[PDB]
Amino acid sequence: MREVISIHVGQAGIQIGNACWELFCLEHGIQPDGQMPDAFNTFFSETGAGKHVPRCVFLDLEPTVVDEVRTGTYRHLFHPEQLISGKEDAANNFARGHYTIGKEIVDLSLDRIRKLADNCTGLQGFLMFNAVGGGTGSGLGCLLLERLSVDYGKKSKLNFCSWPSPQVSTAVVEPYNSVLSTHSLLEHTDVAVMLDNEAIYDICRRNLDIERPTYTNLNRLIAQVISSLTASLRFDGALNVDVTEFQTNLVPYPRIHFMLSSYAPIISAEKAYHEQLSVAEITNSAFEPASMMAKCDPRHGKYMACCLMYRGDVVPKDVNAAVATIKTKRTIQFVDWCPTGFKCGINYQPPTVVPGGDLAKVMRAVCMISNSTAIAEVFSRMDHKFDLMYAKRAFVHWYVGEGMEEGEFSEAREDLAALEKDYEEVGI
Amino acid sequence: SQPVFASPLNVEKRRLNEERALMQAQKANIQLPPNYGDMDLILFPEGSLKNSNNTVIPQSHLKGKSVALYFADGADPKCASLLPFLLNYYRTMNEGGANQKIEIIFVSLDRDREAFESHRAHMPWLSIDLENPLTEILKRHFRVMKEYEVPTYGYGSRTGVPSVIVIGSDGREAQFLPICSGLEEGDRALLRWDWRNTKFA
């Protein structure tokens, strides 16, 4: 029926997506095999008598991340043809994932996604998951979205990009991979949610009191953002808002479509003991500047749109009071031309605890997706790290000697400089 | 099927449940082999658990209380350095309360009877006798070893000494507290005890 397709290209997308697919499986009560003992139809296709399969295509040039899913305990959830593997790595090279080892695998994945899309009409959109810093996630993502834009022009699609932090970056050529990716992640995506790893690192220190969190603890808490985001088209709600009504609310102008994210509460088993988590308090923690998941301080920028997703035991006349206090507060600053600054949403049944996890049982939660001029400094930052290394052509020959032309770089940087000028323009 | 398929406790569980199944079928349209959800097991036999008085207590007593296995060794530096936290934690949690909320069952890796007695004399909570088979059954079931000195069937070490495992009625692992594990928050991992949801039932 109505259905949305998820793609995970690159390692970062896959590990995050790997954490998605216990959460979606637990919520609907399906098993590692795929059989229960019309709601879940938006993510699970019926496969005869009670077996279900997810609508997720895994695409990685590395076998070493996807074959480990085929041998894993969730061997039987996916269709065996649905996990697609290549031969050779992109190796942090945008030119590799887009020009050379691109073509050998893209039309296999497009043939897979076409046999997944054409079963039902009333397609909602795409949930692509990728890495900005990487080679696969930057290159192969662009190559994927080129084909999808050609045939399905007027169907929406939204991306989750793990944007590089200022300090924590784990690689050397990621400022190259950023400007090059973000050139084509303007005109091929409708919603680009930016996640940052050192932001979630800060949250893991002050809320969970985890001094040593791995990728999998980050990915569990990223998957809670995804699950709360989509639950309106999947679960019965009191006032629900779906993917097709996001793009109207949150995106004011064609190119300004990068949104931050925040979640509240983020409370372990020690603490739910002691707080009640009333609607006024959990919506205040949502707007708290250290709870943003980008490390992009909203003090030096003016908001333009916010989408609050209440999920759990929440009544509408408490939300209205809670939102009102935020409007009156003068340091969270709203832009002049947007009176309808808040678009809220309420769902009934609360987020599910992954048993033996880190997060605790909560009777309610808030997912907050904000659009603001704060992220001017993020693009200005990456513009700066690009300009030191490009100034005298470090690592240029890796990209040049492989398929692109020196002049690709300067053309992309005019694009990112043009993006910077757009945020300053819309801010005033 | 929790946590592992190939454990002595699970295989004996499976054997008993399918004895029951076949015999019920033979006595009188019934699901073979039985589902894991429908399988049942009494975990501690009638006289495996003893308190500080060395008086045996039956299994039925532990209900309503969050029970944690404590895998420990007397001679181990880390067990010696962890014992005071756990003692203090025991005190401050089940003293000041409406009800007793926590309980610890101690299972031992000491070298012999005498070492086990000397280490069990510090225990105010419950303990399984060293020469009981049930000790080794729980070793293999929860997949703990100091280093690879017992045959595991393709798995690895879940963890090592010391460990605490909050358990459930059916021998399931409720949560792992990360002392000597990936997370490495030992002597602060005890704070992460969720005693709402892990009621013995």
């Binding site: 216990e22 637990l26 009560g29 480990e68 894993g72 305990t73 969730y74 999998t216 | 929790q2 690879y148």
Partner: peptide, 22 residues
Amino acid sequence: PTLPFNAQSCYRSEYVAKPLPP
């Protein structure tokens, strides 16, 4: 001279079959 192997993968130690919600 072969000592055994006592280290766990990230996948195997953690993405274990979770108990199911009602």
